[model samples]
Target: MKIHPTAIIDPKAELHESVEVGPYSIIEGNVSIQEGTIIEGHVKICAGSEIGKFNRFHQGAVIGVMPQDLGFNQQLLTKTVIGDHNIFREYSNIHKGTKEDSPTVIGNKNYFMGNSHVGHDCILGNNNILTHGAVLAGHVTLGNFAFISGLVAVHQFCFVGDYSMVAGLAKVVQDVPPYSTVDGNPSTVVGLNSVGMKRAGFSPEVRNAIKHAYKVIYHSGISTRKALDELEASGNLIEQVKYIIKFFRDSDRGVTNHR
Candidate 1:
């Protein structure tokens, strides 16, 4: 309980003794800070926040704040639940859900760069990186191991898939498929996420399978069902290709492809 004398903590808030709060930070009532988490100066963890172990909130990062939706008039008592080992940098804002059951949820080991934003009810998976100033609008679902580059704007309800890399400043209005690299306004899949795959320790065979899958989906100029058919008839669907097919099949916003 090494809270700074200048910090303000609500009496109802629960914090593990190992947690440390720096100068001028505020932890509001009903929030729970878990073991080994450090809150730097001027941070605000609003009520209903459930911050997990070893998380670091750098200066001025706000969590569990009110939703920014136009229809939201501060009636909701939603939550912002964060898992372990997340690093949210300065001015990166995360909001709670619009409804009680659908809290804004962030999974483990994600990094949010400065001024990046996560809107209400947005769900994020592990190992995701939001580069500087990226904005994810309300209800966006970001998959695991994805890279959202600087200043990219993700539309509401869009699903950015696993192992995906979105180019800097791209306006993503559609769903990005797994293991792909997308760019441009109204983003299109220009290439595979080769570097990400390699970093994830995927083998050459898996990469080749994903490349073939990408070619069928983006280059063949066929309907999505036809492309999926070709993929099934081509060869054994590896794990990566299976995820690719499933991602396309389940895309409600429609998957983005190369222009």
Candidate 2:
């Protein structure tokens, strides 16, 4: 392990030889730092945390902290599981799960921006972006390639589907279907995530198919269930289209339509 002069690492902490702990960082006991990861200044990685390789935690990013729940007085075994190649910017806080059903999970290549909070039991997927001050409450499930703008407050148990975009300062009370754009204080779907899909390398045909599905769900004026039925029979099911359809079927809290 390559520890900087100002870094404080507990004797019991397990660190890979390739890991770099920068100035003023604290790696507590029982924590495992995989190879190719860098812990920058002012980071406090507590015990019981396992971080994967190539993860970069910027200044003041604290992991494995006690839960913010009122009942949590630092008695629980809160564990933060972080995946590879993630960039946790300055002051982003990620807490462990409240229950055994989920542990705060951040998948590969995610960018948790400055001052963001990942509450207990939040399950995150790959290539996601949580902008500055984005707060995800307990048990929130964010799918792959979703983009949550700054200061968005995601209510507990809400699910953000893949390729979806949540605008800044929105309150997500329910699940967001895939390939959709949700905005406003109380989140309402506006349309498809056309820009995001284009950047994610989705082809024009796939984008059009998803757009068609969106119209069927929002513009057709059909019931959510009936529109889903119509979409299934349309027969243009690609990967993106299938994911958008599945999001509706899998939603327990029901998804929102463009308002």
Candidate 3:
């Protein structure tokens, strides 16, 4: 490891041979840094963080901090487990888990822009983007390929579905359906994320199936249960349509309504 002279690293911290710590960075407690991860200047990686290889932390990013929950204290130890190839930009922060056995998990290849935040106990899937200043409240779950635009704030316990995009400055308080596009305060689904699906190489058939599912749930004017029942009963269902039906079945706080 090539740690800078000005850095303060705990003697018990485990840093692999290829890890690099930049100037004045503080690594405390039982943090484990994997090989090829770069810790840039002034970053504070607190205790209980398990960082994966090839992750980059820009200047002043802080991870594994104590939970911001009003009832939280320092005694109940929790962890923040980050996966590989993720980027944490300047001044972004990720808090540690609030529950004893569960940690906040960040999957691979995510891009967190400047000043974005991930609160305690959140679970994020791969390839998501949190634009500048986007904030995820505690216990939020993000699916793969979710694009949360700048200045958006997601309420605690909400789930953002895969390939969903929340436009800039939106406030998301409920679950967002997969392959959907949502915007506005108290965010509502305006349309399917067709462009994202196309870029992801989804076939026209798959896109059409998803579109049909979206319309059935949002525009058919039928009761939600009836729509879902009809979808399940419909023969020759596509995989994408099955996944959409499953999302609705699994939703707890319920998904955003059609615009």
Candidate 4:
């Protein structure tokens, strides 16, 4: 492992043999870092955090800090868990959870661009892209393959679904359905995430199936059970479809008005 002379690492922090610490990076006590993780310049990682393999943090990233929520009680009991192969670009911040002993988790292979902030208790799935200046308020849940465009802000407790793309400068205050392409402040559901689906190698048949599913759910004016029944009858269900349908069926906060 390569440790820069200017970096500060506490003796109590656990680091794997292949871990690297770069200039001016500080690792406080009570942190456990797995193999092949790279901590880069001017970054601050506090206690009660665990990072997995091959994660890279660029300049000025702050991890494991207490949440900005006034409801937070100051304690070291909260946990921040980061999974493997995540790239945190410059100035990105990941905050600790508000509730004691709760975790703020980011799953594997996610890309967080510069100036993006993952708020307290946010749950992120794999292979998601959060563009620069995207701000997720506390408790936002992101599904797999989600793309958040620059300057977009997601309200707290909102769920953005898989293969969903939020357009630049959009503000999301509600649940965005799977495969949705949403844009604008107080967002409007524009269409399916066709381009992203294509890029992800989803078959045309699968894409069209989800399109019809959304239409039936949003446009048919029936309840969630009715739409799900219709989708089940249509027989084009995949994991993507299952997740999308189930999300609506289980949502505590009702989803967007777009059909």
- After superposition of all CA atoms, the RMSD between model 3 and the true structure is 1.0
- Candidate 3 at 203: error in angstroms? 1.1
Task: State the lDDT of candidate 4 residue by residue for 193-248, as single tens digits.
Answer: 88889999999888887887788887888986788898888865788788878888
lDDT of 3 by residue, 38-157 (tens): 999999999999999999999999999998888887887689999999999999999999887989999999999999999999999999999999888899999999998987888888
Ranking by TM-score: 3, 1, 2, 4
Pairs of colliding residues, candidate 3: none
lDDT of model 4, residue 250: 76
Model 3 regions more than 4 Å off: none
Count of steric clashes across candidates, in order: 1, 1, 0, 1
**How big is the RMSD of model 4?**
1.7
The TM-score leader among the candidates is 3
lDDT of 1 by residue, 152-229 (tens): 888888999999999986999889888889998867888889999999999998899889888887788898889998
Q: List the residue pairs that clash in candidate 1.
A: 189-257
Cα displacement (Å) at residue 179, model 2: 1.4
| Tens digit per residue, CA lDDT, model 2, 14-103 | 889999988999988878888899998999998768899999999999997777888764755667888999999999998877654456
Off by over 4 Å in 4: 221-225, 233-236
TM-scores for every candidate against the unseen true structure: 0.97, 0.95, 0.97, 0.94
